[PDB]
Amino acid sequence: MTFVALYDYESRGETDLSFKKGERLQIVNNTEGDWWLAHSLTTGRTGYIPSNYVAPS
Amino acid sequence: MTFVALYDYESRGETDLSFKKGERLQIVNNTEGDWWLAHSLTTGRTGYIPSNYVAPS
Numbered sequence: 001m002t003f004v005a006l007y008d009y010e011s012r013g014e015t016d017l018s019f020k021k022g023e024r025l026q027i028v029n030n031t032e033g034d035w036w037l038a039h040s041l042t043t044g045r046t047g048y049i050p051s052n053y054v055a056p057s
Numbered sequence: 058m059t060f061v062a063l064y065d066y067e068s069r070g071e072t073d074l075s076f077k078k079g080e081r082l083q084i085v086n087n088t089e090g091d092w093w094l095a096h097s098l099t100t101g102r103t104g105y106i107p108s109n110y111v112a113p114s
Binding site: 002005017020024055 | 058059060061062063064066068069070071072073074075076077079080081082083084085087089091092093094095096097098099100102103104105106107108110111112113114
């Protein structure tokens with residue numbers, strides 16, 4: 001649904017959205033789902049992941 | 058907590074994590090929070106946003 005920006009955010013990459021405080025933002029339905037910052041116990045690498053790609057142990 | 062990868066994912070950017078099916082992933086506590094794909098009604102731009110930066114209308 002509709003949300004409002006509480007703070008300014010400047011994009012740090014290619015896919016993230018820059019926005020100013022007060023902007024009206026609308027959540028897009030995405031197949032990937034919410035993105036989580038995750039650490040791999042298998043490889044030791046760390047980064048953002050799509051939540052729909054994983055499941056609890 | 059601990060999660061397992063259901064599918065392979067190849068990183069498309071600089072900050073996302075590549076992982077193979079079966080890897081054990083651990084969610085990192087992040088100040089930014091979950092990242093959502095959002096569309097701005099103010100600017101018309103669209104991209105990923107940190108959920109902790111916004112609030113419901």
